[PDB]
């Protein structure tokens, strides 16, 4: 009944982008930039990228920022791959309206293959997923977009899994669905062919050797129409981690909204919300929600976060806490479009790791493409402990604020704090 | 395939108990619970069915010496006259938790009334919480008032008397007959209730009645599920239908509100009603007013859940839930009366519907414990709905209603749901 184990010497590394000027005294991980350049340098056979959008250059953003150099170097290194015999396949979300695609035009000219996926037509969503699969051996999964700002001006969390071909091949099955749908005349098949199916899921995760000790790993995906036989839905994977927690649930996610956003009429979506309420009330689980805040934050989030924060009670052992993580901006940084925010999307418990591409609102689980990596591993000092340490560093930092914080005190625009 | 209409000249009267000292200047065409009950007893010629939780109609029952017990003692004296006059008196009463004297029921048995104790703890792990009277298969009382002298003079109560409505009275008797059957030695929940328990009158096809001279739709819902024969709408489904159909406002006055299965070990989260109210305000911009009672016996865990709902008020989304606590003042003399000086009302009114119940709004009342609710809709300005709305707003606007930030020192009685 249990599927075949993996014999690969899998190694996981948490990789962050830390924005220019954001300091954590006496806390270090390899950067997104360093990890990506390393993957590109080592690529010999194949590179698959699932992507939301491409702005790797100053010219793409109409800026003259020195901090765009890292993104520009990534694009220059990507351009070397197809000429040296690497099979480059890039799946990209179709943009809402007309938009120039300088990065992808450059990669096409280099010999890379590019397909735009019209998720708006197919599912009324977008291709939000961010991952790389390198030589069917290594992968990056996380929050970082193909954006120079993702390296130097926004906070990101991802994982690079090295030397893990069984899980790399499993992730490629998710990529292949995007790749298929990127073709002219494509439609959602009523039944995905057998080659898209996986044996590795919530019920029977993949047995891997992760950093020299046994672990259970699987990859969940969204949305439901893209889900072949055996593939765990992202929402099911996420709620299973919440439902199995017996001590704590720590969530760092850019946006949290228990709704189907931009819907007409508005639709309430309490799947995750009731999961967290159940955890704290039934099992006395300590919940810490670290939500990002910036000038583009949906203001409707504040009331729902205040609603969760109200469930702290010493007698029932109900204990949900909410903080807003705000990346400070100086005058120069404030001029950079869509920068100075924390893009992390992950969850860690006492027993589980969840690393995602999606924000925690309903569209990400019903219409929009996403992928998550689920790991459990008996013992201490592993991937789970490292992610918990990152969460607590951010939670305890001067960049994290209670909901009663004065908006005028936090060092960037924040739509989720009041004047008082 | 709609069922037969009722041709009876149905007349509904809202009946309240207003505790000694509780004043509403220039508000009170409502006859009292005491007045309405004495009227029903004086008119009774053939039959009286009472569903009851407990009997304490005398000072001796409560070990008190209160002049305000006189109304209860007069109700017991008038009840004792019925069986000797040839009235068939049938009393279903909840089995007590421990050994208790039953002076009132011993007196009624001596008069020739029939009494059965229903062991709901054995049958469903609940209690027989329902309060209703059916008089001559023609009139009924349904509401919050127990067979308790305190229910007349020392606690606030809300009920309805439906007069000259034999179709609906006979329909209520079918609920009574379930209690009456289960009160017999050797009883068990039948796998299927016999057809004579079934009703044609429910949420899908309510009874067409002439209510105070104009057409109305009325049905009776019941709890818990094991007592529910074919055709009978469950109380929870009836309640949630009124919430789900509201387009303007939902006004709820209920003694206790707790989105849990209370006293469960382990603790169990129960968001059925909670999510209904959140959905109403978020999806449909429904203005929700929750008027929860508070006294020294209030379960303190209610506060956090009420604060959680109150957090959903914001101008842009049109989310608008307000919570107030209704507190009956008690001086030192009033405070010595056991289990008094509290508001027992359980009802809901919207712009289009009336809900009058016997149950508090927590999970046990919809899963294990016996309850009954009357559901009425009626086209036109005014009527029963307008009268119940006027009672709600009288209580809501009164000096006895308090925001959750009110000092516990400032409400005229002990209140466990205010911080102080
Ligand atoms: C659908 O149809 C239903 C049936 O018709 C409608 O219900 C009825 O609604 C009517 C209008 O509101 C009700 O009439 C009113 O009843 C009021 C309550 O009356 C009782 O209580 C009075 C006060 O008792 C006193 O209180 C102390 C404690 O504080 C007690 O210890 C002691 O009992 C005190 O007496 C009591 O006085 C009254 O008795 C009446 O007194 C009359 C003298 O004024 C006498 O003629 C007679 O004895 C009578 O029984 C009751 O016991 C009452 O306040 C109110 O009176 C006032 O208003 C009228 C006009 O509306 C004025 O003429 C008076 O001068 C008063 O100012 C009035 O009688 C009626 O009771 C309801 N019917 C039933 C069967 O309950 C229902 O509304 C309708 N629905 C819709 C949507 O239309
Ligand atoms: C599961 O297994 C995996 C795989 O083994 C494991 O992952 C590795 O984790 C280890 C930690 O245990 C990592 O080792 C650390 O790597 C750090 C590397 O950081 C990079 O950046 C450094 C600084 O960068 C900045 O500053 C320089 C200034 O000059 C600037 O150029 C840059 O632009 C940037 O601003 C840089 O120094 C470093 O470069 C060195 O290493 C690379 C190869 O990684 C090499 O090519 C270079 O020539 C150079 O030697 C690198 O680019 C590093 O900081 C850290 O440092 C140790 O030493 C210092 C003192 O010297 C101590 O202060 C500190 O405490 C550290 O001990 C250390 O080397 C390793 O990188 C991971 N492996 C991979 C592949 O990513 C997981 O953790 C395991 N999980 C478990 C066990 O749970
Ligand atoms: C992934 O596997 C490669 C080997 O296939 C690892 O590289 C080797 O690393 C060890 C330690 O530095 C050396 O002894 C070998 O000489 C290296 N071999 C090659 C071919 O490079 C690599 O370290 C593994 N990656 C991770 C992150 O663990
Ligand atoms: C219920 O029905 C009875 C009739 O069966 C109503 O009583 C009558 O009231 C009217 C006044 O409107 C008088 O014409 C009669 O004297 C009464 N008849 C009897 C037999 O008493 C009664 O009012 C109806 N409504 C209520 C609320 O009881
Ligand atoms: Mn788990
Ligand atoms: Mn999903
Ligand atoms: Mn309705
Ligand atoms: Mn029910």
Residue numbers in the entry:
A (entry chain A): 72 to 98, 101 to 493
B (entry chain B): 72 to 98, 100 to 492
Give the article text:
PLD3 is synthesized as a type II transmembrane protein and proteolytically cleaved in lysosomes, yielding a soluble active form. The deficiency of PLD3 leads to the slowed degradation of nucleic acids in lysosomes and chronic activation of nucleic acid-specific intracellular toll-like receptors. PLD3 has a typical phospholipase fold and forms homodimers with two independent catalytic centers via a newly identified dimerization interface. While crystal structures for RNaseT2 and DNase II are available and provide important insight into the molecular details and function of both enzymes, no experimentally determined structural information is available for the 5′ exonucleases PLD3 or PLD4. Both PLD3 and PLD4 belong to the phospholipase-D (PLD) family of phosphodiesterases, a protein family that shares a common biochemical mechanism and an H(X)K(X4)D (HKD) signature motif within their active site.
To gain insight into hPLD3 architecture, we determined the crystal structure of hPLD3 in the substrate-free (apo) form to a resolution of 1.5 Å. The asymmetric unit contained two PLD3 molecules. In both molecules, amino acids 72–98 and 101–490 were well explained in the electron density, whereas residues 61–71 and 99–100 were not visible, likely due to their exposure to the solvent providing them with higher flexibility. The two hPLD3 molecules in the asymmetric unit formed a homodimer via helices α10 and α11, with an interface area of 1042 Å2. The hPLD3 apo structure harbors a bound phosphate in the active site, which is coordinated by five direct hydrogen bonds with the HKD/HKE motif residues His201, Lys203, Asn218, His416, and water-mediated contacts of Lys418 and Asn432. In line with the mass spectrometry data, a high mannose-type sugar (Man5GlcNAc2) was well visible in the electron density at Asn284. The electron density also indicated that the side chain of Cys300 was oxidized to sulfonic acid. The cysteine sulfonic acid (OCS) residue is located in a deep pocket 20 Å away from the active site and is coordinated by the side chain of Ser294, the carbonyl oxygen of Pro296 and water molecules. In the same deep cavity of OCS300, we found electron density for a large cation that was coordinated to the oxidized cysteine side chain via a water molecule. Careful evaluation of the electron density in combination with an X-ray fluorescence scan of the crystal used for data collection of the hPLD3 apo structure indicated that this density corresponds to a manganese ion.
